Amino acid sequence: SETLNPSARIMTFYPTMEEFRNFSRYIAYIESQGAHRAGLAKVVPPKEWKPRASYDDIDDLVIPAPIQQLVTGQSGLFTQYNIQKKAMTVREFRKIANSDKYCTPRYSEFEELERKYWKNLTFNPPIYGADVNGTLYEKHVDEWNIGRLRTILDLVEKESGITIEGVNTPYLYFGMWKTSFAWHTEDMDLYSINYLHFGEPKSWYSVPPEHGKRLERLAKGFFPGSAQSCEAFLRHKMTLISPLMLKKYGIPFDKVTQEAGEFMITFPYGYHAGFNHGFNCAESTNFATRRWIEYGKQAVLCSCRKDMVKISMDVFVRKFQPERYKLWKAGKDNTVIDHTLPTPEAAEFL
Ligand SMILES: O=c1[nH]cnc2cnccc12
Ligand SMILES: [Zn+2]
Ligand SMILES: [Zn+2]
């Protein structure tokens, strides 16, 4: 496991239509390749696959709570205050996105736009049409349908009947230039899938899960007051740390640009942050494999109740780890997670 992807670099995959039909099996395959080590992987779907005929019929879709993204800070360290604005349509949002005030600046290469984002992120706050409940997939699409992934995370809805927005349901993100997401891991340290439906690119930064604690120690040192108030303040999704800051403090990280028509997979305990190049739309949700159960059992949650997502691990432990159930309920489960190990389902490829 330590031999595959030794630098824990972001990997890209090009499945065929046959390989694209079994979602869970393909995630097992990419892990057998060492993809998970980076904490982020890109999946380019087969040319024949399309989740919708066109996007010219969504102008009247309402973004109920758009957020103005105010950033405070300096020297590569920032706090993001996401201000709720009144509801707007996709057409109203696209008009603001493409206006002279908010449009993407003229640039040659990504590195120019990236330098531009870190120089100007505290000025002219943009509007992010983020966390919109909904899907852009046509009803008949069976392959990589974010609405219905059919992973083991489905036990939460199957056994209890409870739905957690964006976690076991899809979220839509309407972006504009300079909109962004703060460093974070998923709720319960779950996996996530992100499909960029259309528009301008979305740039990502990732820290390998095996270096995740180094990012946490850096954050705690910089924000001691926040660290004193909450056990996992990064779950508030307010902390921005520049790649230059990470480089200076020796935090290993990688960066990738996602283009329209591509999927991004985040792995358990894979910290990620990023920004939108301009007007776009992405669909997202969380999912699980057998490997996540131990991450969910060990996840450190927000203790100040600013973040409320908590999944009971009991059903997963009883069903997939019965030999460990009594030891775990007694608080005697001393399992140490090896972040390099692929999911057990990967066995057929190894
Ligand atoms: O594209 C994103 N927008 C907002 N939040 C996110 C969280 N994780 C991944 C991607 C995004
Ligand atoms: Zn995320
Ligand atoms: Zn908290």
Task: Give the separation between CA 26 and CA 32, rounded to whole angstroms.
Answer: 10
Pick from 73, 60, 165: which is nearest to 118 by CA? 73
One-letter amino acid for residue 235 of the chain = R
Cα dist from 302 to 76, 96, 170, 227, 259, whole Å: 24, 34, 22, 11, 32
- Concatenating the DSSP letter of every residue in 274-291 gives EEESSSEEEEEEEE--TT
Pick the atom of ligand 1 nearest to 131's CA.
4
- Furthest C-alpha separation in the chain: 62
Pick from 216, 69, 246: which is nearest to 255 by CA? 246
Q: Which residue's alpha carbon is at the smallest distance from atom 3 of ligand 1?
A: 181
CA angle, residues 145, 179, 174, in degrees to nearest 5: 35
Pick the atom of ligand 1 nearest to 186's CA.
8
Give 158: exposed, middle or buried? Use CB within 10 Å, 0-12, 13-18, 19+.
exposed
Residue 320 φ/ψ, nearest 5 degrees: -110, -20
Task: Give the separation between CA 299 and CA 189, rounded to whole angstroms.
Answer: 6
Breaks (C-N over 2.5 A) in the chain follow: none
Cα dist from 340 to 19, 171, 267, whole Å: 24, 29, 11
- Residues assigned a catalytic role: 166, 173, 184, 186, 272, 284
Task: Give the separation between CA 122 and CA 144, rounded to whole angstroms.
Answer: 36
This structure's resolution (Å) is 2.2
The number of helices, as runs of H, and strands, as runs of E, in the chain is 11, 16
Structure tokens, 123:
């000025």
Query: Is 186 flagged in the annotation as binding?
Result: yes
3-class secondary-structure state, position 172: strand
Ligand nearest to the CA of 309: 3
Give 237: exposed, middle or buried? Use CB within 10 Å, 0-12, 13-18, 19+.
middle
Q: For domain 10-350, is the CATH number 3.40.50.300? A: no
Rg, the chain, Cα only: 20
Helix ranges (DSSP H) in the chain = 17-20, 23-32, 90-97, 110-120, 155-160, 212-222, 224-229, 243-248, 292-298, 314-320, 325-329
User: How many angstroms is it from 307 CA to the middle of ligand 3?
Assistant: 6
> Do 263 and 43 touch, CB atoms closer than 8 A?
yes
Query: Is 276 flagged in the annotation as binding?
Result: no
CA angle, residues 293, 134, 53, in degrees to nearest 5: 110
Pick from 177, 166, 187, 204: which is nearest to 10 by CA? 204
One-letter amino acid for residue 92 of the chain = E
User: How many angstroms is it from 17 CA to the middle of ligand 1?
Assistant: 27
Which residues partner with 79 through β-bridges? 72, 239
3-class secondary-structure state, position 134: coil
Ligand nearest to the CA of 306: 3
The coordinates were experimentally obtained by X-ray
Cα dist from 163 to 37, 155, 169, whole Å: 30, 11, 7
Task: Give the separation between CA 343 and CA 75, rounded to whole angstroms.
Answer: 39
Determine the residue of 194, 283, 307, 309 to mutate for testing ligand 1's pocket, defined as the one with the most ligand atoms within 8 A of the Cβ atom: 194
Task: Give the separation between CA 173 and CA 129, rounded to whole angstroms.
Answer: 6
Half-sphere exposure of 93 (CA within 13 A, CB side): 31
CB atoms within 10 A of CB 153: 24
Q: Positive or negative, the Cα torsion across 47, 52, 56, 62?
A: negative
Q: Is the CB of 193 under 6 A from ligand 1?
A: no
Residue 24: DSSP 8-state: H
Tell me which residue has tokens 């899907």: 135
- Concatenating the DSSP letter of every residue in 31-84 gives HHTTGGGGSEEEE---TT--S-S-STT-TT-EESS-EEEEEEEETTEEEEEEEE
Residue 268 φ/ψ, nearest 5 degrees: -55, 130
Residue 62 φ/ψ, nearest 5 degrees: -95, 130
Backbone dihedral region for residue 234 (phi beyond 0: left; psi -120 to 50: alpha; all else: beta): alpha
One-letter amino acid for residue 269 of the chain = Y
Give 8: exposed, middle or buried? Use CB within 10 Å, 0-12, 13-18, 19+.
buried
